[PDB]
Amino acid sequence: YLIYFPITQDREQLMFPFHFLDRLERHDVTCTVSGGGRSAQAGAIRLAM
Amino acid sequence: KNRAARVRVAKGNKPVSYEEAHAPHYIAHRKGWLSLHTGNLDGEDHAAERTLEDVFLRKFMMGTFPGCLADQIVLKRRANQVDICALVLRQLPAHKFYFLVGYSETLLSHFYKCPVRLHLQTVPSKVVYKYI
Amino acid sequence: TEEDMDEYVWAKSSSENSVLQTLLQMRAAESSVAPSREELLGTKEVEDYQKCVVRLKNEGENEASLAQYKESVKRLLNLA
Amino acid sequence: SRYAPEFREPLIDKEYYRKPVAELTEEEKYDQELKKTQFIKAAAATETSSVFADPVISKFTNMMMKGGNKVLARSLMAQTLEAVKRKQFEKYRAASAEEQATIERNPYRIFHEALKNCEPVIGLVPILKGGHFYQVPVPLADRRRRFLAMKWMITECRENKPRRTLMPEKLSHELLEAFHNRGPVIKRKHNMHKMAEANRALAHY
Amino acid sequence: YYVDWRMLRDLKRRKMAYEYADERLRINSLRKNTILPKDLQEMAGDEIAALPRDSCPVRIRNRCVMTSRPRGVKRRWRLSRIVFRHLADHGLLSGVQRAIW
Amino acid sequence: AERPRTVSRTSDSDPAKHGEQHEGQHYSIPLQDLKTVFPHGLPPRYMMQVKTFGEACLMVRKPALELLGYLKNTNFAHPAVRYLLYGEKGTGKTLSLCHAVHFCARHDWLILHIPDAHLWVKNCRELLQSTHNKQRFDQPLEASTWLKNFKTTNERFLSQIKVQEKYVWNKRESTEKGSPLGEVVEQGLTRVRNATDAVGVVLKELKAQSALGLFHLLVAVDGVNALWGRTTLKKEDRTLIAPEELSLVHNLRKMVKNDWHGGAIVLSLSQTGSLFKSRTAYLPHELLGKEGFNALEPFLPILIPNYNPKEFESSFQYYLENNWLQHEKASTEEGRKELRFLSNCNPEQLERLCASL
Amino acid sequence: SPLSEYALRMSRLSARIFGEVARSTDSKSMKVVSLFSEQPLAKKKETYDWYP
RNA sequence: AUGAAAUGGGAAGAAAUGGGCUACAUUUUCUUAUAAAAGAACAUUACUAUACCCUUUAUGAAACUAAAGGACUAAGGAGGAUUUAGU
């Protein structure tokens, strides 16, 4: 995710689900996002997670 | 204001049919298409030629059955077959209709080089959807 | 030529020359009499190095395959 | 808007949801039970539970963005904060133990206290009466007072800087110079207040 | 009778371009290359010019088949925007509806 | 807590002492060794950290410990071994290579350190032709800057080593055989036209004389993937140049060959600054290509990974030990866990995130 | 990159098999192949039978 | 003949005005990647011509058209009253 999402705001968007429930570093996620731009793909993953 | 294909309001005494009552934006919603061919489907050719044949076929049927058409005709193309479905008033004698069918079929089959059939449903009088 | 070939062939390649030249310099430093070409390229150390380079060129290059190549170099070059 | 009026703004406060039930005021307690039967808007792309998210700075970033280039605007603000931290670290190391105590090295605290020092209490709304322009003293809301401070900073740096200087180097030099109540932006606030004093009589109009 | 004299001239232009298509193809091929002597290419440039002007296929204009309108035509049906709209708005075109979205 | 803060520093300033016990501990590089061993070659952002913190401290790590081990057991009689540090962006390849340059520098090796080799294949504003071979070109400014730094690092060895041949710089100026190698360096700086030729003499002299046992030679080239790639320099005909045609690139390609002995070659790959390479390319064959890979084999690839849990905590405490992380929530466990996610333990990303904070 | 002899002789062997242009032909001279491989605009049924 | 057809033309502006386009740069310019990052440029032509002029290619029967280079480069330094659009 650091390689796929070189922008911080995209990574922060993936941090929101786990950080909110204090579950950082406790799960292993495998994503497959097709379509849209960088921000739309991070947002789509956030909801899927 | 939009003036296209809208039979405008009179004073409640104008008898409009179902087809005439509905404006263009009701096509594919409340009323269908009078002609059905495959020439406007995606990746299909000969739209220009199918449309020109339709324009003529409608003018031919009006003149061949003058004053005897209750509503617009429906054209149905399947393979090379053409089928004309017309609502016709019961004004003319029965034997006269057999003449115009034999004539109009043979004439249009030798003009467009396809098998053409005429389907006539006779009504006692024009069917009125509403009075506008 | 080598560029045309789609599947790497270690035999008679830039790798074989580079490997043979290194092994010749290694035996010369040892003060041994100049050895034969077949002798140097028949050793097991050179056998393994052939397999690893071929894997990198044909099978694909990745951290796992590069780790295998690292070990072959250590054996071939007598590195601790 | 694509959100029906029944939708509710999302609440992204991590501590609030995890507080013990008894610690919540009954008004707040009521809203939680009500929201269970309501629709909630999806959270914005820049809305997170991060502990490093500052709303004031996030707003300042959007007021610098041009043409939807958020990456560049955030980069400029990130470079600014670093340029302010690095300017205070140099001063701190090159200062005596007594001076070292006063020196502030937190860029987030220099940014907030800078903006606050540039916020004007009163305003001036220009009016036209009888074919002349009579601007009159006005009172400004908490939203209008904050907007003016941020706008005045982003406009001093954008315009009144040398051609080869960059925004992270002009903005850093102004947040710190404002943080000490001596910058040109502070003068803009002083000029606003001094004009309002002059127009005290024209407030009636 | 065609719609107007402008449609008649175009119809003739379309029938004379069909007659001289092979000729203008064979001759023009001699000019669109760099393999033949420039003396031959300059001469083929004059044989093509000597052909009648109505053989030239760039003088054909697409006109509405029913009203002979030069502009506003849709090439898939060969009708002007005004004529196309009359057939479409009455349900007479198979599958054409108004676009609501 | 500050338990990793004790693990965030080590008292062993000398690179030889370092071992596995010292992993994840930051050793301070002496001030004199910064202005002598490292006048160039340190990353630009790292140099900013050295100026603000007032001290250079390099974390001891397993990749750089493996390299120091091979250098200690070097068999000088055997041909030189090429060590290739390959890793993803920001993983620390340049600073791992600088750790080796400190170890060799303290053992009295002769340092031949090319700080960045991409700078020689792009953005050149003066490109002359070479008298030695008219087909090649000469980069006066690129060579002149390197010589001034090479002089500083090896100033001690510039009087002992002496040229073994005669070099005619101009009709009126030549170098007599036997004169100190410093004279060759002095002429290059004095007359910029010969700068690209003085460099070639220096590289040639050191390579030949090293085998005589007088001195050891560390050829430390960072960004070696530039040599066998493409350039963005154009000839008077506005036609792009090739790497070989350039004189500096041509000479260096010889030094990175294993046809000599008496030293070791330490190479590093960097996609940053690379021309015509993807952003996500880090592997040796992707960056070196078919030409570069064949040139350097057999080489020893040393992967530089991301910070491990021990290394990340030590780096986090080092920033806290210098008061860099000034945000109130940075010291907390929720801040630390956040920075671990956003950075992903990448050394460069962690340095960038903490810079703003 | 340049095309070595093996590459070039293979390319000619392929063109000979697939009925493609075998020689080195300029972009200008490739229009002759287009003119004689495509129906001309005036010979297409849409043009000459545009009108009823 | 106010009808039909063929050939050749249907020109310009020390002018005013509406709309659009580009620029006036540092949140910028050039290059590689890609919008990440890096190396250079950065005031007299640095930013900056979708004009003129000069070449080449494309369509055509016809270049008077379009595109791409080349040089040439002038003005422009964010625009008075006033006015447009956007929840």
Ligand SMILES: Nc1ncnc2c1ncn2[C@@H]1O[C@H](COP(=O)(O)OP(=O)(O)OP(=O)(O)O)[C@@H](O)[C@H]1O
């Ligand atoms: N051993 C280390 N000690 C201290 N900081 C380190 C170390 N390794 C990496 N870092 C941090 O990571 C940053 C990047 O390091 P470095 O430049 O060595 O990486 P790299 O992999 O060579 O990068 P690139 O691919 O861009 O060339 C440094 O500026 C520093 O903040």
Ligand SMILES: [Mg+2]
């Ligand atoms: Mg035309």
Ligand SMILES: [Mg+2]
């Ligand atoms: Mg590096």
Ligand SMILES: [Mg+2]
């Ligand atoms: Mg007339």
Ligand SMILES: [Mg+2]
């Ligand atoms: Mg960018």
Ligand SMILES: [Mg+2]
């Ligand atoms: Mg032409």
